[PDB]
Design an enzyme around this catalytic site. Structure first.
Site, PDB file in Angstrom:
ATOM      1  N   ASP A  26     -10.420  12.505  95.676  1.00 15.17           N
ATOM      2  CA  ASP A  26     -11.734  13.339  95.746  1.00 15.17           C
ATOM      3  C   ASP A  26     -12.965  13.153  95.835  1.00 15.17           C
ATOM      4  OD1 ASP A  26     -12.776  16.081  95.392  1.00 15.17           O
ATOM      5  OD2 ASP A  26     -12.054  16.326  93.716  1.00 15.17           O
ATOM      6  N   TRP A  51      -7.011   9.388  87.861  1.00 19.51           N
ATOM      7  CA  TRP A  51      -6.164  10.456  87.946  1.00 19.51           C
ATOM      8  C   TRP A  51      -4.977   9.256  89.086  1.00 19.51           C
ATOM      9  CZ3 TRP A  51     -10.740  11.785  90.121  1.00 19.51           C
ATOM     10  CH2 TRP A  51     -11.343  11.134  90.806  1.00 19.51           C
ATOM     11  N   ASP A  70     -13.338   6.405  88.507  1.00 20.12           N
ATOM     12  CA  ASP A  70     -14.823   6.311  89.330  1.00 20.12           C
ATOM     13  C   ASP A  70     -15.724   5.104  88.758  1.00 20.12           C
ATOM     14  OD1 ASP A  70     -13.309   8.845  90.670  1.00 20.12           O
ATOM     15  OD2 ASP A  70     -14.048  10.198  89.039  1.00 20.12           O
ATOM     16  N   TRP A 102     -13.603  12.310  86.458  1.00 16.23           N
ATOM     17  CA  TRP A 102     -12.662  10.911  85.755  1.00 16.23           C
ATOM     18  C   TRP A 102     -14.179   9.538  85.886  1.00 16.23           C
ATOM     19  CZ3 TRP A 102      -9.228  13.011  82.844  1.00 16.23           C
ATOM     20  CH2 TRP A 102      -8.418  13.708  82.906  1.00 16.23           C
ATOM     21  N   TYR A 113     -20.515  11.463  88.571  1.00 14.49           N
ATOM     22  CA  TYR A 113     -20.040  11.193  89.713  1.00 14.49           C
ATOM     23  C   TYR A 113     -20.296  10.610  91.388  1.00 14.49           C
ATOM     24  CZ  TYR A 113     -16.776  10.724  93.494  1.00 14.49           C
ATOM     25  OH  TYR A 113     -15.644  10.089  95.008  1.00 14.49           O
ATOM     26  N   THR A 116     -15.393   6.716  93.783  1.00  8.49           N
ATOM     27  CA  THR A 116     -14.027   6.601  94.180  1.00  8.49           C
ATOM     28  C   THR A 116     -13.220   4.826  94.408  1.00  8.49           C
ATOM     29  OG1 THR A 116     -13.737   8.214  93.152  1.00  8.49           O
ATOM     30  CG2 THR A 116     -11.977   7.823  93.567  1.00  8.49           C
TER      31      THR A 116
END
Length: 124
Positions: A26, A51, A70, A102, A113, A116
């Site tokens: 994501d 995650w 991340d 995360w 963010y 990832t």
């Protein structure tokens, strides 16, 4: 194509959203902004948090446990965006929730963010 179709991983192009490891990604692929499939780009902070998801490796017929950590402390890269939810559970089951940022654990308290990574953390 057909955003509602069963997921179909490939194992030939890590910058595409159907690459087998991104089954529960994501956000944006780090490989598109200076990072790598498993390392963060220069300047960002690697989170300790993540995650997880168990994604099928079409090549070996196996499943590995992916830890989506991340890289943070930067604004969103904007390159190579994806949203895959293979086996993603509600927020009340965080370990497998992908709307959560995360970044916990990144140095300097980075919580913004950027991208990832998709490192393999173990089979199955």
């Amino acid at each position: 194509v057909d955003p509602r179709a069963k997921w179909q991983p490939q194992d030939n192009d890590i910058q595409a959203c159907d690459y087998w490891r991104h089954c529960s990604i994501d956000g944006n692929i780090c490989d598109c902004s200076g990072g790598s499939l498993t390392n963060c780009p220069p300047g960002t902070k690697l989170a300790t948090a993540s995650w997880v998801a168990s994604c099928y490796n079409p090549t070996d017929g196996q499943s590995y446990l992916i830890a989506y950590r991340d890289c943070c402390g930067y604004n969103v890269s904007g390159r190579c965006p994806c949203l895959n939810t293979e086996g993603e559970l509600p927020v009340y089951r965080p370990e497998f929730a992908n709307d959560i940022i995360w970044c916990f654990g990144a140095e300097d308290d980075a919580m913004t963010y950027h991208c990832t990574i998709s490192p393999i953390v173990g089979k199955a």
